[PDB]
Amino acid sequence: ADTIVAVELDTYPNTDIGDPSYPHIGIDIKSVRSKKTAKWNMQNGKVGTAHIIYNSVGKRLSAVVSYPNGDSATVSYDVDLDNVLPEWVRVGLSASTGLYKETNTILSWSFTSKLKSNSTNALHFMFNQFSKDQKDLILQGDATTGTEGNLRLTRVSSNGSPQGSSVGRALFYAPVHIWESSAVVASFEATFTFLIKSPDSHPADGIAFFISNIDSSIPSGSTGRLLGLFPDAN
């Protein structure tokens, strides 16, 4: 039912639903099977940063993930999002664990959306420290805000261990007006920083930044490879 555009940081290759055979960053347009992907070296226990950029003029959704040693992966995809998303949306962060696991810790998250006309309406928010009672965020599933200033999208246990089978998402409280047919420029950018750590045989499954219909919720059974985004793998 939900309408999803996402950028996925995919730590685990599910080569049976069309992942490449390596960790990857992807652009997802109404499907977990990314329209475009690139090879990502996930750096275990290090803090990475993702940037996501779109505007309605070039109509190219782009993303880049990097670490402080300077290694980065990038991915771009040509798409007119006007023809994909409702005019009003909510923006959010998603994460999963499945059979393998990992911390999915958000340390910071910022977002800007603008409509400029013919003829500016704007929304911008920036979290660099989350609080225990984040009244601006809609937490779904296992997602907690802690007292340590962080957003934990998936269940971690009191000794700091990540759990399997977990799914969590945080959405900004106010609906966003992503497009407006008489805006000449409708643009958005998002940025988050994240710590993925695992002592496991392999890390799974990743974190996503997403945009959806306003009333979006975690689809039934979207742990593991579905990243809390999609009711299935089609």
Please state the residue numbers annotated as binding site for a carbohydrate: 12, 99-100, 225
Closest CB 61 distance from a second copy, rounded Å:
23
Please report the DSSP string for 51-80 in residue order.
EEEEETTTTEEEEEEE-TTS-EEEEEEE--
Residue with token string 């000449």? 184
Q: Do 186 and 55 meet the contact criterion of CB atoms below 8 Å apart? A: yes
Please state, in angstroms and rounded to a whole number, the distance separating the CA atoms of residues 162 and 157.
6
Between the alpha carbon of residue 8 and those of residues 39, 44, 169, 182, the distances in Å are 12, 17, 13, 30
Q: Are 206 and 10 in contact (CB under 8 A)?
A: yes
Task: State residue 220 phi and psi, 5-degree precision.
Answer: -45, 125
CB of 231 to a second copy, least distance (A): 25
Is 10 one of the binding residues for Mn ion (CB under 5 A)?
Answer: yes
Question: Least distance (Å) from Mn ion to the CB of residue 84?
Answer: 19
Among 41, 74, 129, 161, binds a second copy (CB under 8 A): 129
- By beta-carbon proximity to a second copy, the closer residue of 136 and 232 is 136
Summarize the annotated binding site for Ca(2+) as residue ranges: 10, 12, 14, 19, 205
**Interface stretch with Mn ion, choices 16-24, 64-72, 171-179, 191-199 (CB under 5 A):** 16-24
Residues of this chain, 96-125, that bind a second copy according to CB under 8 A: 117, 120-125
Check: CB of residue 85 under 8 Å from CB of residue 152. Answer: no
Site map for a second copy, 61-100, x if CB under 8 A? Answer: ---------------------------x------------
Chain residues binding a second copy by CB under 8 A are: 88, 117, 120-129, 131, 135-136, 172-177, 180, 214
Chain residues binding Mn ion by CB under 5 A are: 10, 19, 26
